[model samples]
Each structure stands twice: as structure tokens, then as C-alpha cells.
Target: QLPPVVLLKTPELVSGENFKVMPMHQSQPCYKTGLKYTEIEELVPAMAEKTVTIRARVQAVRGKGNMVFLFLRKGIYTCQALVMKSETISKEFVQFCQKISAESICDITGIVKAVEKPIEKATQQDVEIHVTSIAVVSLAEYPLPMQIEDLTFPSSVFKKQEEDIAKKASAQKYVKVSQDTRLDNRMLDLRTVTNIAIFRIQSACCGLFREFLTSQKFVEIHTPKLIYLAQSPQLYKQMAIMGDFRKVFEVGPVFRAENSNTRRHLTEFEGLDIEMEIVENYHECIDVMEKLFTFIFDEIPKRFPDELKVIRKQYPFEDLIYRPFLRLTYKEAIEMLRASGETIGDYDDFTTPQEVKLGELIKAKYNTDFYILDKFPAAIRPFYTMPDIDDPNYSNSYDVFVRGQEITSGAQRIHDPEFLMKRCIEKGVDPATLKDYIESFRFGSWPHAGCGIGLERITMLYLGIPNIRKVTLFPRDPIRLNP
Candidate 1:
């Protein structure tokens, strides 16, 4: 059924005559003779005297007259490899190893050897490799856009800078990679250990979300992103609930067409959306949200202690104080802000600084970094938001925050078709535009509530990161469009 293709003449393989080391081409003919490959993380002290093969990027090459020490990295782990001029190893080989540039991928065969004292430079400090044979799998060009070490400075260096500034004394000079530079050279920047750990933690967060939800009988659904980019899966998830799906969740991209550029805003980000039918009140949904977050926060430290350690080495932060999440009403929050000398109005939304100040006040009083602010003013909520039965001024909406930053916004929806249309008209939205959404509830729908959480915001807030871009991979912002 397929078209016939003509085969081209094969080229002859080049011999390694003029150079002591040659770059790999196509596939090596003698690959069958190579030893089994091992990861750098597996080279522990127990593996001493065992010959192993590893493929990793050459992080650094230190050359002495008769010996060369190569720091090799694989994923988030690094190990020291020594190539000394000895009887079996040639001086030309040592020179070739010394000349290997940083970030070049190489295939190294070595014997694991126990170190006299721990090597402080690499992750695998108790053991090192006595490399016997090395082959350049891929040679990198000199003069990279940025070096990885510059971006991986320890947290202590930053503390020293702060202390020196406080004392009005000259601080030791350290290379500080700007955020723009790091984002510009993202591929090279991602090779840093901290980034590797961050993304791993992010991935684990998504995995944990699915794991917990599925265990609670929630169906994972994938919706469209191309017909028109969704700001959130709000409408579709609600529609699913109306169609007899009691519980549903989506992990997908959310596009925002906003021009604001700030530390927390992104043009595009991942959204974790959930919708479910409530039995009695929307508090059932709130309870599920609290449980979901509690599960995620409790599991993160248990699953990723190594990753946490790696990230803390660069950006130090205290573990989040998330015991029992505090819940406050909108009126109560306003009262607290007023008591703290803030002049916020009763029906007004919170500014960023106001939200941060409120978070600090709550933490001081409750000793917790997470909480829920409920019962927003009806005028501020979306048209579909359910108004409070007791008061028309307030709505059954809530926002979840961590460390004083909003990570989620959710509310119970008006399931009655007539009320939904009336609310839409009240909000000045054309009912014709949302005809499909309005009509979905006409055939008798259950009372439902849900929330959408920003994935980057949650990760960033949980780690105490100042910028949302730090947790986003290849972030699309107001000004950034290219890698």
C-alpha cells in the first residue's frame, strides 16, 4: 500500500587516523563490544571496583600535566571521573579528555573507586570513577551562551551578599545569571541541577493530582484546545456534570489574552480544573479541594526529598506551615484588613499588596500559609456564580491561597436556566453568545460546584518562589515568544 523508494549508496566509514579521538557518526560498528551502561547516580561506594559504562554530559574538565579530572553529569546527579596517564591509558587520551568542552555528551568506561575523603563538588561525593576509555559521542562547540555553574550558585552565596550589603562592606564577587539571560538560553539553563529538580517536582504534582482524583472516583477528561483556546475548562466541565458525569477533572493548557506583565502573570499556563455535583451545599466541593491540597502537600516531601534538597541549595525556603487550612468569610477578611489599618471597601476586590499583607496577618495569627476566603460579593463574581440564598449581595464563591498569593478561584454555578440567563443579562454578557452553555442546563441539571487552579502558581507558591516563570517551562509571557 506504500510507495516504493529508491535506496542511496552507503558512504564508507571514516577511520580514526589523524585524530586521537573522533566524534561519533551514524552508529558505531563496534557498539556490540561496549559494556553495559550505568547511570551516574548508581555509582555509589558499594559499587567500588566494578567496571561500568556511562553516558553523560561533561560538566567540567580539570587538567593537570599528567592527569585530567572530568566532572560528568546525568540528569540531577554529578560524579567525578579521573583519567590519569598510566600504562593502559595514553597521554594523547588524557589530552583529548582535557580538551573536551563543557556540555559535550560522552561515553565513558570506568571502574568505581572509593574516595579517601568526600568530593565536595559533585552529588556522588563518596565514590569516583577511574575512567579507562572515553569516546566522544557528541562534541559541543566552545563558548556557550551561558555556563550552568553561574546559574547554580548556592543559597549561602546570596545570603552572604545580603549580609555584606547590610554591613556596608564589599562582598565576594559571584556570577549572577539574570532571569532574562536564563530564559533566553533555556536549553543550556535547564541543565542546571535546580531546574531539573523543579520540573521533576512539577511533574510529580500533576501525577499526584491525577492519582488522588482517580482514587476518589473522578474521571480524567481531555477537552479541545484548537477550536478556540479555552481560558479555563469551566464550561465544558460543567456541561459534563450536567450530562450525568458526577465528577470530572481536566489537566490542560489555559490561554489568557492579557497584556499585563508581572512576576506572576503568564500569557499561557496549565490549569487544573475540577467540577462535581454537590449533594447539599458547595462546602462539599470546598472539603474536596482541601483534601486534594492536603494530599498533594503531604506527599510532595515524602516523594521528593532529594529534589527539595537540590532546589533549597539554590533558592532556600522554609517548609510550608500547612496544618489545618484556615477558612474565612469575605466580611471577616475585610474586618481583619480594616483592623490592620487597610482601607479596603466592603464589596471591593483585593490588590496584590493587600492580598500579601492579609496573608502575612493570617500567618501571624493562625501560623498557616494556606487558607480559603469565601462568600465574595455577587457583583464581582461571574454571571454563572450562584448567589447566596440568604443575601443577594454575596455569592457562594471562594478563592484558595498559599503564602498570600491566589492559586485558585471557584464557585457554585446557577443550574436553573432562567436564573442563569437573568444573571448573564445582569452582567451585560450577550446570552446569544453562550447559547450552547445556557441550553445545557435546561433539561434538569444537578447543583454543581468547581474550581480552576493555576499549575505554575501552585508550584511557585508552594516552593516560595518569587517569580512564576521559575516554575514554568518555556513560559509564554507578554514579551517572551521565542526560546
Candidate 2:
């Protein structure tokens, strides 16, 4: 006779000591402990023979018999942690260490030791950690959507030509993570060294922009985002100048309702806007704009050289050549395009391909990736743009470019309420919609000019990145809304 088998409704929920650091509840004594921890970047050869505690994500784990090697990551820094089967190390502990999943956060107490041969894969190569104790703080699940190793590979490896060549050259194949896959798991994707560096550089760009403008005695203003969502902070910045807050700048979100899914287009992006009273001419504004850009360009390399280097490891790019940014008229740009076999009208706005072609031409002629195209045709500009004093066919407008792509668009504004309404009617814009804007000009507004700069575009262009989404923190495209 067979023994009656018992079917359990639920398996026993056993709690194991294993490598668990603490209880899963909120009220834990560990939170109150004063344990000083060091960062991976601080783990250098100078720290050899010193004991330290570090909390980091397990970047990788490799086991060979009695010893296990762990690669721990903190931001862009990585260090090797070695665990050996010794007097204090038990077999169960070794098994636990070998089973630790990649990307799991852990607290490790270890003695730093100088290595004879450098560890090639880690940032802290000269020193390795001899782990005394390791406990899992947050264990990640197995089978990640994308591996950090694949994400860390140079972007060139994912190129079609390189992919084909690599297939022929090696037995070990590298997995190529698609852009969509990365964006879908953006939190995991951003853990890569390149992304960490890219965002640091992006942050520096904003800091530098604010620093330069603030040093110029420009007052920073915050504009409303709810009502119109304010495309460029243009109207408000101008109103600030009118209210005697001369020389105003704003760093805020700019909304666009365009449905285009181009590489550079974004539904929402940061705008760096400036508006100032013109002393003599709109060119005065241009002069200040030029200086502001020069200051930013000069400071980025000085401030974030390491970040640039880290990013370049994954996405190679030549240094931006921006010395005395070249200035050309719109007519000149059109003529140059025509010379290069492009059929473009003098008054016609440039197409994307045409803009790229023009950029290459400017780079060839001027030896620069940055330039300004001035005096755009008045018929193509907004009604608020001032008509050129000498030529009514053109407006006092300019566009600043980097690598032939427009990063900024600016112009002198018509301060006269009557002339503004006339231009509005000429451009088919209803004066009723902008009644308040026109009325503000009626109260003796100063002659002013300003520009609206695309923050993501500038950062992308500066790094020679092809897609604007790569530079944006949480890019909002027509298709992508969720994290």
C-alpha cells in the first residue's frame, strides 16, 4: 500500500539567514548605526591596508572553486572585491556569494590591498578589496532586460558595418541593446558609465549657462508654465524688461505641440532664454549672446574634462572647434547653398537636410562647428520680429548654429504698439489673441532683443551626439511618455 500523499495549499514561507543584511521592515536598528562608508572612487592604491565599508551595486560576479570575484559599481567608478574560502569563510557563504545576482546593492566591509598587476576592467585598477564580510542590501532579480556589459560597449560596435565585421572576427559576440529597449528600462540603462558621464556633463552645461548669465548682471526670472505652457519664455522675458527688470534670463521648460518624430524634435525641452534692453542696436544683444556662448564653451572643458573623457569612451567625438564664431547673413547662407548645387530660394526657410549641408559647408570654409546666420527674410519671421531699418524685405533676426543645426533663434522686437498690430495683420495673426501683449508695448517699452536657446540641442551638438533624446534626462517624444 502506498502512503497517502499530502498536497499543501501553500508552501512554507521559510525565512533564511543566508546573506540577508537586515529585516524587510521599516523600523530597523541598522538605520540608526553610524557606519561610515567610502565611495569606489575613493578606493585607490593610497588606501591599501586600510579597512573600509562600502555600499555599491554588484556590477558583475565571477566564481572559481573556493574564491569569488565581485565587481562593485558606484556611479562611474568600479572596483574589484575578492572573497576567498578561508578560516572565517564557510562553504555556505561561498555558495551565497557565487549566487549573488548582478546589479544587486550590497554592503561590503573589506581591507584594501595594492595589486601587483592592474585590474583592466575596473576604474579603480591599482587597488582591490579583500572582502571580510558582504551582505545583500537589495537583491536584484535574475534575467535583466538588458545587460550593463552590453550597454557599456562603445556605440560604434552597434553600427551595421562594425557588427558585420565583429561577427567575422570573433567567437564571442557582443549583444547590441536597441534604443527602444534602453529607453524602456531607462533606470537600468542609465547605470552605464557613459550615461552617468553624459548626465554630469548635461548638468554642467546648465550650471555654466546660469553662471555666465548671472556674472553678466542678468537677473534670473521664473515664468508661468501652466497657461500657454510658454513656448520660449519670450513674451514674459520681454515684459520683464518692460517692467524695468532689464537684462533678464530664464531657464525653464518649453512646450511644443508639433507631431514630428524627427531625431531632434521633442514635445518638451528646457529653454535658455534671454531678453535685454537694446542700448543702440539689436547687434548689442548679439554681442552679449556671443560672449555668453563663448563663456559656456570655454568653461565646459575646464569643468568637466573627466566626464567628457568617460563619455568619449562609449561615443567617440571630435572636440568642438569654436574660435571666434563666424557670422553670415541669410542671403550669404543661401548663396553658399546654391553654390553647392542646392536649389533653395533666398526667402525660403531651410529644410533639415539643407541645414546639415549648409553646416558642412560652413565647417569647411570657416573651420568651425558654431556660427550665426543673421538678417533673415522678414516674410518668414514672426510678426513680433522687427523689420530691418535699411531693408523691409529682411528682419533683424538671427539664428545661432552648431554643426549647421539651429540651437537658437532670436530677433529685435517691435516695441511700437501700432507697428506691432500692423505686422500682426500682415502675418495673419489675430491682434485679439495677443491683445495683452500689444497693450504692454503701449506703455513706453524699451527697444529690446533676445534669443530662445534649445538646451538639449546645445548639449547634443556640443557633444556631437546624433539624437537629442540621448542628451535629455527624461525625453518626452510624441511616442514616449512613461519612464
Candidate 3:
């Protein structure tokens, strides 16, 4: 039941000669050979002393009297290849590879050999290829906007440098690309081994989230990122509860029009949201959240040991220490802030500086980078959040934090429609304007609670990465729009 296809006539060769030209082939369509290719990664010790074919970007090209050494890379792997001006390899082939610009795509057929010397700046430093033939698959234009060599510095240089080390690093002759410049050249920027590892952990985080929730019988749901009403699927996930879906979760984009340009803030980001039917207290929600984090923290290290080592080499940190994060009341957090010589107002949100200092205190006292602040004052919470049964001034809401900043905000939702409307009016959100949301409670809504965790924030905090921008692909803020 497939449509018929036709193949075009191949380009005819002119009589007796195929002349070479600059920027050759004029972007012509490729003719298929139906032959299997050997990826660069397959050049292993088992395949040593045998001829192999590989295609990769030229990381660098160096030449001397009768030899050319090429550093070839694909993804996080790099290997060295040598083209010699011998009988098997034409003198022109040796000259061809020597002139090859950095990052140009090339195909190589070579004999794999064990390393006589460690390859410099290569992922596979213990192996070498003696090239018999090599051809340019694609020519890279000269003067790359950003050099991969300069961007290979560890992630720590941006965040945790001391006075002396910082000064020394600043004195290095290598170009330290600014955030804007790196973003402008993101395609090239993402080619480093460290960046590749960051996103691998990012992907694992998403998978582990889904893995945990799915095992708990939570059905995966999709929600619209574009909204006619609100910023998140806070209402839709709650609406799913009204429709008899007991437990659900979603991973999707959320938008904010805020113009704040800070290291942690982004106008658009991925959200990991979960809403579930609660048994008794809202701690039921906290129980699941705690277990989820415990699983993620415990497994990420085991699953991505190499990635962790790779990232730490660039951006070092003490491994996150926590089995289950400490839990405290909002009032207790305020008292702790005061004990640490921080001036925090009761019932007032902790500002950035206060949060930073408080994380130091928590780390010192509890020896854990993760914790939860619960029973928030009603003044700071949204209308949908359930008020405490004993005291109206405090709400049954909580926020989970790692290091210092809040990563997840969640609460037990109000099940009573009348009380929900009253809380809405009290919070200055007109009850009439939120008709659809309020009415979801009208049809005997379940006593449920949910939380949303920003995915980029979690990755950034977990890796101790300085900027949320570093973790996001094609990050968007008020000003950034293009690649």
C-alpha cells in the first residue's frame, strides 16, 4: 500500500575525464553504494591489525615531512589517523589531508594499530589508524567562529574559581568565550564532550522521572504548551482527576513573559508535573516526591558514572549527599535564617541572597543539599492550595529545594467548591473569571495534591552548573530568539 517512486538519471561523466574543482560536486545528490559503514567507535582493540573504514569530523590536522596526523572525532569519541606519502597512499593524499581544515567531514580507510604514544586531545587516545586512503566528505569553510579547543575547559572555571586560580585562568592566552558568543555559536558549542555529557544526564533525568511514575501506575498525559487561559497545565491535570484518572503526570513546555535576565531564569522551560489522589495528609504527596528524588539521585550516579566524571573534570562539586532530604516548617526555616544572621521577615518570601545563605546553613547543620519547607504562610500560596485544617494563616503547601533554590512547589488542593471560591476571592482572583477551574470542584472533586518541577533547574542544580542556560538547548529568555 505504498506509493511508487522513481529515481532520476545519474549525472553523466564528461568524456574520459572527471576534473577536480573547488567547492566540488556543487551540492549534488549522492549516489548510493549499498555498503555498510564502520562508525568511528568500532575502531577497538579487537579490530586491531585489520583494515577499517570510518567517517568523522577532523578535530585537527598536523603535518611533517612524509606524514600527516589527523585527529578525528564523532560525538564524545576521538581517534588519531596517519596518512603517509608511501606507495599505498599517494603523495597527493598526504597533501590532501594536511590541508584539511578543522571540523571538516572525512572518510578514512585505514589499518588500526595499537598506540605507540598517547594521542593528544583525543577520546580514544590509546589507538591509532594508519590511513591507506582518505577523502573529504564535506569541506568546512575556514575561520571557525569558535574553536572547540578553547571551549573544552571544565565547568568549574565559570562557577567555583578561587582568587589565585581565577586570576591565572584569566591570564591564559586561550579565548574564553562569553555566554552570548557561545550561544551564538551553539551548534559548534555543543560539540564538546562535557556538553554532550550534560544532555545525557538531562535525558536520563526525564527517563527516570517517567520510569518511577509509570511504575506507580501513573498514566502519562500530554498537555498543550500554548494556552488561552494560563501558564501551566495545573488546571488540566486537575481536570483529569475530575474525569476519573486517579494519577497522572506530564512533561511539557511552560512559558512566562517575565523579562528577568538572571542565571537561573528562562522565559520558556520544560516542566515535570505530577498530580495524584492523596490518602490522608499532604505528606502523602511529599512521600512520593521524596522517593522520586531519592531514586533519581541514587541512580544518576550509578547510571552515568563516566558522564559525572567528565562533567566534574570541567565543573567540579562534592557529590550531592542525601538519602531523604530534611523537612522543616516555613516558620522553622525563618528561625534558622535568623539564627544564621539573616534578616528575613516572617511570612515574607526569602529573597535570593537569603536563600543562598540559608542553603549554607542547611548544608552545615543537616549535611544534606536537599530539603523541604512545608506549611507555608497562606499569604504566599495560590488560592487552589488547601488551607491548614487547624490554622487559616498557614497553608498545607510545601517547596522542595536542593543546594539553595526551590526546584518544586506543590500543595494539597481544596476539594470543597465553596471554600475554593472563597480562597479565590481572598487572593484577589475573581471567582467569576476562573469559572472552569472552580467548576471542576463542583462535581465532587477528589482530595488530590500535585507538584511541578522545572527540568532545567533540576539539571542545573544537580550538576552544580552555574547557569540554567548551560543545561537548556536553544534556551529562550526575553532577548534570545535565534540559534
Candidate 4:
């Protein structure tokens, strides 16, 4: 037995103003009123207008004494109708609702009115429709509800087989589903308004990031994702932006063939890379990235409050201390962490989350969102990173960390043709294929450079989803291929 439960709309929209919501099963707790299945509530005429007309599917019908209520579902919302003095409702109509069961789909014309019931604790706001014509568009199974206590949970009759692939995947690691299910039903589970809003905000942030940078005279460039082997004897060409001509940046998806499963990794991921032939030094690139992050951190909460509420569930109070991020070089970080976390010695690198957290601990004391850790050991940086002209041991590299995890890594690139070629050879990558890219700087270059940020990492951190897969719709993990 259950109380008279008034269903609420399932917050989803189909078109601009139209939604596809209908009230479902009632909650299982004793609220203000204490009625149950003993006194089932009927649909009463409680509406704004007296004789409103509508066409919909007749979902239910209940009667007590001389009055009857017809529960109808019209797309998004449902209403209860009172059929008191209806000469048009034929005997066949009453029999159809009682014996043959209401059709799941149908077309009906009715008079809608209001009810002012002052009796029990049920929804007082409602409308009643007096049916004039009823025709079944699609039939429903007989003996509906199956039990007297119809709308209660644990009423095994209404429950059916659930084939949600996402749910199954989350429950089972290796469970797979067909592509049809992935495309058709994925949106059903992802219907939460917060999730929908989160993606919009993500898109907005990306657009704004590009808008903000491009507005500042940044040149957009595209590079082939496929990279071949390196062959070179030139240091500048092999190491950095090939010391040639132009300054450029590219952003796109990159793929790797690694058979590893970890929390902080993905094979198909976004890369926001930049190699600029600046008129000056490379710190301008770092400055751009810092501003980009700051802009997003500021925009995320401002544009997506509902999504933030969802995010707060997982990461409450995990603030991305913005404005002034903590900055420390590899050498400086090593010394400070050794004095504090007491795990470091010398010339060491932050290779793990434990190391990541020490940076966090240092940053937390000062309250910052991001930081620039500079001058990493040249060996630790990638082959293309420019080395300090004065110090051969360390590179002019930097990592930008936000909320403890590193978000972006950048530095001045080796611009000399000789330097680039030597670095490419040492790194085992072919220099010829990169000649076109190198031509931007090889023979005629600037002193500029840039870095690439993980688009998802930047957005996810701003929204606080740990697993990158959750941020992506129908994520393609190694095992999850089709659906």
C-alpha cells in the first residue's frame, strides 16, 4: 500500500519549449498526509481555465460514487480529469477504461476544468478533462497495474529488463554493448540537467579561450597528428622550433598505443600545443597559458552553477586557489620539499602524486590555483625543450600545476637550426618530415615559443571530475570500442 503520490515532471526538453516529462512512481515515505491505497486519489478538475481543449493519451481512470477522474498524459505533463456530467462519454468508453485497459497511445478531445479539493494531502494544483471523443492510436496490454496497489514501488508488475550499457559498464569492467544501444540510449542516462549544462560550459570555455588568445594576435596552426622517426645532425633544428621563420600553435586530438590502465592517463586525448617564433623570449607563452587557466577557473563557476552543485558532491571545498599560483623550479622545489615533506635529496623530480602533493602542500600554505615550476633538468624535459644557454644541465622548461596536478608544460624552444637538428637526432625522431614545420623557424625564426594543455584536464579540473572518461560522452576506453 502507498500514499496518493503526485508525479513531478522529469526535467527534459525535446524542442525549444516542449519537454518529454511525465510523473512516475511516488516516493515511499510518510509525508504530510497519511493516506494510502485504501483511499486512492482520483483526478479532479483543478485548472486555470474552465473549458480548455487538449488531445492526448488517456493514461488512467478512477471513480468514486457519482464522480470519475481520467488521468491523461500529454507529452511532458500529466493531468487529472473529472467526468461528472458527460453525456458524450459513451458506455463503451467507460468499459474500455475499466476492462480492456487504457491505450498507451491515443487521440482524445476533452474539456479541461479545475478542482478545489480541501480534503487530504495531495497535490492541490491540477486540471480535469471531460472526454468528448476517444480513439486508440496504439493499444496497451490488458489487466494493467496487475495489482490493486498500482503505483507503488516493489510492485514487480511495472519493472522490466534494463539494458543500459553505461550502467552495465560502470557495474562490470569488461561488459560490452552493441553500437545501437550506445547511440540510442546513452542520452537517457546522461539526461541530468547538470550534466547537460556542464558540457555547454565546457564548450563555452574552449570557445572563449580561443577567442581570448586569438584576439591578442596569436596565430592558429594545424599539424599532422602522425609523427615519423627523426634523422638529423642539426642541433637547433632537431631541438626546438627549428630556428627558421614563423610562430605557430596547434590544438587537436592525439592517440598513443599504450596498454596501460591508470587513473591519470588516456590514449585518445586533446593536446593544445604551441611553438612560437616570438619576437622576444618564451615567457610570453607561459603568461598566455596562465591567463587561459585563470580565465577558465573564473568562468566555470560563473557560467555553470547547477553543474558546480553536481561537482561539489565529489570535490567539496577543493578550491583551485586562483590568481597567484605557486612557482618553483626543480632545484628550488627539491630543496623546499626536502626541508618540508622530508622525502627529497638533490636533483630529483616529482615523479608521483606523493611528489605532486608536496607541491600541493607548499601551494596550499599560500593559497594559489596554479604555479609555474621552472628550469627542470634538461634530461627530464622532452628533446625539443630549449636548454638554458648558460647551463647545459637544465632546460628552460616549465610546468603549470593547477589544484596540485600539472596542467601544462612549456618552455623556450631551441630555435637554432643546428641545435634543433641535433636534438631531433638524439631523440630518435626523423627531422626531414618535420622540415615543413621547421621551415617556420629553421633559416628565419623568432625568439618565441608555446605549450599545449590537455583540453579535458583543464576543463575537468575546473569542474572537478577525476576520471577523464566521465567528462566525455560515451567515452572510448581501450575495452569500450563500439558502445
Task: Please report, in order, the local distance difference test score of every candidate based on alpha carbons.
Answer: 0.87, 0.86, 0.81, 0.55
Report clashes for each candidate as comma-separated counts: 0, 0, 5, 49
Worst lDDT 10-window in candidate 3: 12-21
Q: How far is 275's C-alpha from truth in model 3 (Å)?
A: 0.4
lDDT of 4: 0.55
TM-score of predicted structure 3: 0.89
Indicate the TM-score of model 1: 0.92
Q: Put down candidate 2 lDDT per residue, 1-483, tens digits, no spaces.
A: 976754423111222343444445376887454878998889988889999889999989999979999999988888999988888876767777888778888888889999999999999989999988876776677677788988888756667545576533454557765788988788888889889889888787788889989998999999887765676678778889889998999999998887778678878899889999998899999999889988888989998887888888888899988885899999999999999998988799999899999989988887899899999999889999999989999999999998889999999999999999999999999999978888998878899999899888898999989998889887788788977
Q: What is the C-alpha lDDT profile of model 3 across 302-386, one tens digit per residue?
A: 9998888878877888898774589999999999889878777888988988877878888888788999999999999998889
Provide the TM-score for each candidate, comma-separated.
0.92, 0.92, 0.89, 0.61
- Candidate 1 residue pairs in clash (backbone atoms < 3 Å): none
Stretches off by above 4 angstroms in model 1 are: 1-29, 155-172
Candidate order by lDDT, decreasing, is 1, 2, 3, 4
Candidate 3 ranges with C-alpha deviation above 4 Å: 1-36, 39-42, 155-172
lDDT at residue 94 of model 3 (Cα atoms): 59
For 286-352, candidate 1 gives per-residue lDDT tens digits of 9999999999999999999999999988888999888879999999999999999999898999999
Error of 2 at 384 (Å): 0.3
Q: Candidate 4: lDDT of 204? A: 65
State in Å the error of residue 16, model 3.
Answer: 15
Candidate 4: minimum summed lDDT over ten consecutive residues — where? 11-20
Question: Model 2 segments beyond 4 Å from truth?
Answer: 1-19, 25-28, 158-172
